[PDB]
Amino acid sequence: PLVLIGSGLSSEQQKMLSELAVILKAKKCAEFDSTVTHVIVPGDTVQSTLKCMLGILNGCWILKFEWVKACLQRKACEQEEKYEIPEGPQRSRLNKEQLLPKLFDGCYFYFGGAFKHHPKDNLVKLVTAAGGQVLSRKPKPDSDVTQTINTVAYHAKADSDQRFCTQYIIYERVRQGKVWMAPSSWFIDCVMSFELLPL
Amino acid sequence: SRKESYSVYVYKVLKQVHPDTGISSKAMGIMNSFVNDIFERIAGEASRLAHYNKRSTITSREIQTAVRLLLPGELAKHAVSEGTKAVTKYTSS
Amino acid sequence: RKESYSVYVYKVLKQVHPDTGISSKAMGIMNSFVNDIFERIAGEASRLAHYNKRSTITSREIQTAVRLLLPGELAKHAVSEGTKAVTKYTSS
Amino acid sequence: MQIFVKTLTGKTITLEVEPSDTIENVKAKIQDKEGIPPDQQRLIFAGKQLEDGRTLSDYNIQKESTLHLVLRLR
Amino acid sequence: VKRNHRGETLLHIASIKGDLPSVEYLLQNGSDPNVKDHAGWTPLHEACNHGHLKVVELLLQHKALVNSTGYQNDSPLHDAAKNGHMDIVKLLLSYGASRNAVNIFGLRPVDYADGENMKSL
Amino acid sequence: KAKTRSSRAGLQFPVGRVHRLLRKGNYAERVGAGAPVYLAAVLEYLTAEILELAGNAARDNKKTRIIPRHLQLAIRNDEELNKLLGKVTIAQGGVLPNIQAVLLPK
Amino acid sequence: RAKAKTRSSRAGLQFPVGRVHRLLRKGNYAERVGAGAPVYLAAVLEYLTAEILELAGNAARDNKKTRIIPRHLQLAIRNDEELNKLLGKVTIAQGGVLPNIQAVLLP
Amino acid sequence: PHRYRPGTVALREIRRYQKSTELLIRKLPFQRLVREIAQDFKTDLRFQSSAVMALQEACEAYLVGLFEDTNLCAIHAKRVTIMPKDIQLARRIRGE
Amino acid sequence: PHRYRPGTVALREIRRYQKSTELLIRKLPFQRLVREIAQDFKTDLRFQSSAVMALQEACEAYLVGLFEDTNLCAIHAKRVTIMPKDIQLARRIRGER
Amino acid sequence: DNIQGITKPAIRRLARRGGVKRISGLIYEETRGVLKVFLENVIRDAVTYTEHAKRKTVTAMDVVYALKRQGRTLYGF
Amino acid sequence: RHRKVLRDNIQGITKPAIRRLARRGGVKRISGLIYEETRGVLKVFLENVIRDAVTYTEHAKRKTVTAMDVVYALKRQGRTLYGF
DNA sequence: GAGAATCCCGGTGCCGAGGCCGCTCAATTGGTCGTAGACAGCTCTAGCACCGCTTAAACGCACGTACGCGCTGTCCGCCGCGTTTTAACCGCCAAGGGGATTACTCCCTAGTCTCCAGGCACGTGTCAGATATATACATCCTGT
DNA sequence: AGGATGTATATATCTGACACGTGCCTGGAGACTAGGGAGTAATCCCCTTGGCGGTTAAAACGCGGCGGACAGCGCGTACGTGCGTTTAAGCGGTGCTAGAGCTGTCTACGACCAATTGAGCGGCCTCGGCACCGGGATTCTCCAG
Known part of the structure; x- marks a missing residue:
């Protein structure tokens, strides 16, 4: 049930992501909905945009454009856990995948x-x-x-x-x-x- | 003797919360009507709350419910608390 | 033992419209109507008797209350009806 | 752990206690600095009267809190 | 995955009343054992709360989490103490139930027992 | 004998019950003698008006009773009762019919 | 007879307690008033007055003045989010309006 | 293959629903909604049968009254449809 | 000569008048209007001063609120001026017939 | 005829305090109508309150009560 | 001694119901985004009423919300109701 | 000029309005008692009608530049209709929490003397704020 | 990018409104007694929650085509800005009767208590007005000329 979202891609890159999702045949999203369970960030460092911060707080993957290029090349389904932005937006997924509380639970x-x-x-x-x-x-x-x-x-x-x-x-x-x-x-x-x- | 006002009691609270300010003359009239409005509202609600349940007095619980009805949001959860404090300092003397 | 003005409405309806009746889900509306108007008039009369340093709620208070609450045309008929009733009562 | 007590005349007194004591000890420490006898004092905290015979930690008191003190004469 | 009006799935109704063969069939057929309800409880929670040992055993033997939290951040051990039981505490502790986790009110499981052997651990 | 108070004033609504309700409802210290003989007449007049206008519309639809729809139709067409009861919702009633003048076909 | 200590002092208040009692008894709100209601009423009224006069003085010290004129009470009242819905049908005399120009009228 | 043209069934539905008195909000879902919010405020409540009906009547009258003024605001700008901007102007001018 | 283009002095007026507190309508014509209106319900009425002051204050508040609502309605329809239709719509939504 | 004492610049100033920028040419008459209706209502209620107590002078508390009967409390006096 | 709850229930007030209400209002053509706004307004209103109802109930030391309590709440807000 | 949809006209069945009976609890009659409200009467604060003047603000006319309002195209968003999948509505049975009454005993509040300090009207004086001045400097346009 | 108009600073000075002070009269406080409103236990039985099931009325999903919303460009008159002229607001005087407040008597009107009797409430019970169902009539709309 993969979804998609963008956080700084280029216009040509935006069309490329559209075509890649169409090849994957999954629902897209422009406004930040609840079920947005995949986020693609352009660079190679966690930025300070509102969208990326909401993404790290709700809990989902933060993947890079190299995965987009690999999906365009191999044309296959996907291959995750190899291009996730490491060192800090990773403990969040590990916390949400083990049934623990949220961050500011009690402040x-x-x-x-x-x-x-x-x-x-x-x-x-x-x-x-x-x-x-x-x-x-x-x-x-x-x-x-x-x-x-x-x-x-x-x-x-x-x-x-x-x-x-x-x-x-x-x-x-x-x-x-x-x-x-x-x-x-x-x-x-x-x-x-x-x-x-x-x- | 003649007409009574609440002006000797606002100055004290002012001097207690801000020690280097005074107050003008018309502002005192504004603050002197603001108290009468709230007084009449709370009393009028307590009266009817006592009239529905067939009671015949006005006690502290009536005032508590009257306050919780007509003060919005987080101004209730504070005011109520303050009130309770007073009563507990009163019965213990 | 509850109370309700469910017998007098019948008499007024029998004297204004001879062969008609009222359903049970339409008597409660008249009950609530009478109670609300009673409360409004009495409350305004009380406030008006208190704003003058006086203690009796007499007939002039009710006159002024009716003249404030009800709108334009209804007021004259209402005041005339009340005055006629009171003068007939005090005559005997 | 420091603790503030406040009196109706508008003053603040500071005390130092440990979180396993009893109200009687607090009253004794208060009498050691105020002068009022330890048989006429009543303390208030969070809208409820305190009895003598229980521990402080039972009423959920921690560092830097405030208690109110009232007499019984008049 | 047609849930109920309260959030409970089929494993929940199976657990709240011991029907071991039904749970065996439901699990072998395919059903995720970590799915919270609208309050936050999990199958293991209710299993250990009502007092059926074999169902807790079966659930543990299929990779269910052991320190998950729920309403007001109460662990399984919290209920296993607050009600009062003997076997499930031993089993859980043997499996690695944390004995130092805390709830939203700042209390430990040891603070919710009465038995001498209960307070012994 | 005993001539009741509401029958020596020509009314049909009561006069003693109103006296008791004014005296034990905390409105003033004392209630005069000519106080209820006015309230009774005012209430009677208003009720007669509403009921007549309701019965008319009841008859204009080939029925011989009064259900709430008729009161709702008789209130929102008076131009002087619509002001006194403006913030009131009659249960099990409805709304008056009117379509705007622009959305109609050419 | 012992030395008199007033009722407003036992509760640690500044508003009166005799006046509130007398006005609650001779205003026809009920047939008998308890002995603990005036203290509650006084506490609540004092809290409200303090809350408004604390916010007035901040806006007073902003414009570099050492008094309180009605414009300041208007600002302090209309700029909070809960004290606005309580006074949402009052108009202060000699007050004014908050500054706000719509964004489709600027150059 | 007979087929009406867009605009006629709506007028008929207007004329039909403006001449009938009945609730149109599917009771049981409404009951569950009220119970959810009540669960928010206090614990372990239970409702009579008349409370839910009173709430239904009030919360239908409110929405009808809102939609009338929404339609007026929409007509005011040379349009026939209503969008999510008219509701906001209505609620703003009213005072809520 | 040197002129400002249309649409600039208006903003200056807006900024100025939203910062003062003085009364806007003059004082004697309002007194005469109030007396001429009230001279049809009695015959020999007399007025204090606080009375006319209070009436003036309430009137100004009412009109300012009305004009704010009218402006919002006007901007809602892709314009910048205000016209009578806006006053009518505002007053009809408010509930004053 | 004394409604002409409310001149043109006065209405412009009130409009400015409102927040408008361009006024039309047929806006003044409607303003005068609205003002007349409002004043009529308030003054009638005030004169009733005054005539009750057997006086001949409309005072300030009368106008305060008249405004209070409709939701325009007006603190200040 | 557990406790259960309810959530995500504003979706029972479906699309044709809002359409019927709009028809009784007087509209003719409806857009595709009015639904979320309508649901939000409804939730706010219902919360504001049920709070006062439950306060009245809890004052008298009862546990069941009765019919007179909703009437008193609605009269507090500003909209009266005749019939009960 | 044909299709679908709305209005009349009988026709059978079914429960809620309109009368009727005993009896219980509030309204009527006949008295006295202590105190608000009507009505003369004298003192003095404040509102109405005038007059002269100095100057800030309302009236009247001219020019040119945005903005209102009426046209003509392009196309994505919403209405109407037919097949399939979900859960409201109705009638039925069973178990136990909490709304309405009834009694009995006690603690909390109105009603009265008495005396002592908190709050109101009236005086007299010193400092924060309103005004007039020179000027320092932060936008707004038109030319190139 | 200079040139020309506003708005902000800084410093003189000056008049009228705020903060403090002192007799003294009315309302708050301490100490006591007599009676009825509300707190606390028991116990009868009405009505709210929790399940089970068959039937059929509404909700959910999809498709082809038309009317309406939003963005373009082109005219012509109504409103914004700076000037010199004519009307009447505001300030400060002085004389003056009418009407708002206060005070002192004295009488007609309403709270209060007792004894006797008809009106209005609870429950039964049976016939007519309305709800529900099939059948011809007539009105209103859309493609076709």
Whole structure:
């Protein structure tokens, strides 16, 4: 039930992918649907487009154009697991293929300020696809609604301070109680390596 | 004596949350009507909630339900909490 | 033991249209109608009696309430009917 | 583990305890710095009264939290 | 793969009530043993929750995952303790059931048992 | 004897029940004596109007009863009752018929 | 008789509790009012007032002024997402409008 | 091989459905939808038989009332069809 | 001489008036309009000052909202001007007959 | 005739605060009509409230109540 | 002592049902993308009503949503209902 | 001028409206008592009608440049009809959770004296903000 | 790419609105008693969830062809911009009666308690008005001339 999607191919390359899929006789997709279970990225390094980040977060293959060339040459079905972009968008597939939780399973986020380099709806969609939840008011570290939360956060390190404190303020003293403060760089890096890197 | 207002009580909250600001005269009128609106709404809802179930008093649970009905989103889950705190400091004295 | 205005509607219908009847799924609508109008009028009259530092809900309150709620043409007929009823009652 | 306690007059007192103690010990530590006798104090945390005889970790208290203190005289 | 209105497949209904020959036929005929329902449970989960040993044995003998999670991140060992059983705990532990995984509330399986031998491990 | 209060006022709707409902519904401290003899008449007039207009349309369709469709047809054609009941939905009713003037064939 | 300690002080509040009691009893809302309702009402009202006056002062310090005029309350109210649906049918006096020009009118 | 031309069956269906009073939303799916959302908010609920019918009536009246104004907005721009832009203008002007 | 082309001073006006708070309609003609309208329901009416001020404020708010809705409707139909049809459509969707 | 006190530049300024850029030539009369209807409704309700209490002076609270009866609360006074 | 749930059920409100509703509205020609928008609007409305209904129910210490609760909810929002 | 679809006209069967009976619980009559609302009467804040002037804003005319509105082509998106596959609707039987009433005992709230501190009207004064000034510099056009 | 108009900075100065202070009168607090509304146990029986099955009405999939949506280009009049002229808004004075608030008596109207009796509610029960089904009549549309 293979599907297809593109993340930076060329127009001639786009027509080539269309013809290759037609030879494979599979459904294509322009807008990012849920069942998009194959993504083709042009270069040889995981880019920072919205589509590739959604792809690594939902969990599927990230293959390169060499596979496209090989499919065009051999004209056969496919040969996977030889051109997957390694070192970081691979632990995601291994995590989804063993019935484990998602990345931010048990975290809470709050966005505040003016965002210029990146929009807001994109980040909100990334958060709600990861597995966490979004808040609507600022988490002051002296109110009852913040102190009465008992939710350990999986995927953290073995024994650290990111296991009992699971609330974040994100903008564009570093730990006062159970609330952090972090810049957007840490977020967008955390997504493209599949690990909650500390501080 | 004459007409009473809520102006001696807004200044204190202001001085507690922001220690270097004052407030004008018309803004005080705005803040003085904003309280009466909310008061009347909450009381009017509690009355009918007491009238449906054939009860005859107004207790704390009626106010809790009145608040949860007419405050949207995440403003309920905060306000309720605050309220509870007060009552617990009251019965313990 | 519940209550309902399900006997008086019959009398008014029997005196305006002689040979007709009402189905059971059409009496509930009249019930709800009467209750809603009652609540509106009484509530406005209460508020109007409270905005003046007074404690009795007399007939002038109901007059002003009717004149505010109901639209243009219906108001004159309604006020005339009420006034006739009240003066006949107090005459005897 | 540091712990904040707050009093109705608008003050903050700091304490240092371990996560296996009992409310009586906390009241004793409070009396060691405040002056009020240990027979008139009542503590509040997250909208519920605390009894004397249980451990702190049973009520899910961790580092850097806040308790409220109320007297019983008037 | 016509699922039910709750998410349960045929293996689920087979497991929730021990019918071993039917499960044998269903497995030999071809049916994936790792398919979650709308809540997140798996066949092994219900098998170990209600208390039929032979079905857990049969499921394990056909490459089913042993530390999968579900609702509120509860492992099979969590239910095997919270209800109370003897054999399945021994079998699972012999197979490699993690004894240090944690659930969303921050508790370990040892914290959900009553028996002396139960608390012994 | 005993002359009831609703029969010495010429009405048909009740007058005592309204008194009790005004006195024990928390609307004011005291309710006067000429308070219900007005509410009763107003309610009676409004009900008579609606029922007459409904029975008419009921007759204009060769039937001898009143089902909710007839009340719905009698409310949305009055131009003065449509304002008082504008945010109301009658159960098991319908909608008035009108097609726009552009979508018709040439 | 002992020294008097008011009811607004035992709860740690700043709004009154006597006034709310008196207005709830002589306004005809019910036939008898409990002894724990005024404290709840006072707490809720105080929280709302604090939430609005905290957001006003930020926009006050933005334009480099040290007071609060109605334009600032209008900005603070209309720029939040939950405090807008609660006050979605009120109009402030001497206020204004948010800046917004449609994107198909620019050069 | 007789065959009508595009535009006539629609007018007939309009005339037919505007002169009949009956629900047209296939009850059992609607019941399951209401139970799903209710399961979201609380746990282990159970519904009477009248609640579902009341909800059905209200949620049909709402959609009919929306589609009328959608059609008006569509006619306003020299067209005959409705697209997913008219719904948004309607909901915006209304206040939701 | 030196002119700006059409479509530039309008943007300047938009930016200016969306930043102040003063009242737009003049003050004496509104008073006279209110008195002449109200002089058909009674005979010897007298007005305070806060009354005319409140009426003016509410009127301005109403008209500004109406014009915003009209502008949205106009842009919806591939134009830039506004015309009477837009006012009629806005007021008929709102529910004011 | 006093509806002409609402002149042409006043309507232009209100339009500008709205967000429009080009106005047509037959837009003014409709504006005057809408304004007349709105004012009529509000003033009638206010005069009823005033005549009730046996007075002869329309005050501010009367207009506030009249506006409240239709969903135009108007904090400020 | 497990717990089961329901999901992905907005697909029972199929295509011809939306078409019949549109016919009763007054339209004649329908596009091919109105369906998702219609489903979204319906879900939002139903959520906003059922929340208040369940709150009323849970106040009186009951466990079954009755017919009067939906009426009180709809009157809270702004649309009344006659018949029950 | 033919096809499909809608309106009348009997014709049989079937359950829900329109009467009817005892009896129980709220509406009617006949009294007294303590307090709101009508009605004179005197003091003084605020609204209506005038006058002169200085200057900001409403009226009236001319020129030329985008924008509204009516045509004429090209083709992808949606309606109508016939065959096949899925799950709503109806009638039926069985087991157990929770909505409606009924009693009995106790704790929580209205109703009254008394006295002491929190909040309102009235004074007097110093500083943040509104105005006039020179100018520093950030878009908008037309020529080449 | 200079030339010419706006908008932003920076610094003088100056008047009227905000923040603090002090007698003192009305409403909140402590201490006590008498009666009825609501919290808590038991127990009868109505109505909601969970299964099973046969039958037939709607939903899902596909195809050939026509009417409508979206992008082009070509005219002609209605609205935007800068000027010099004529109307009346706004500011600041002063004189003045009409009507909003307050106060002090004194009487007609409604809450409250007791005793006696007809109207309106629950349940039975039987006949007519409506729902469902087959048959000729007549209206309305499309290809063909």
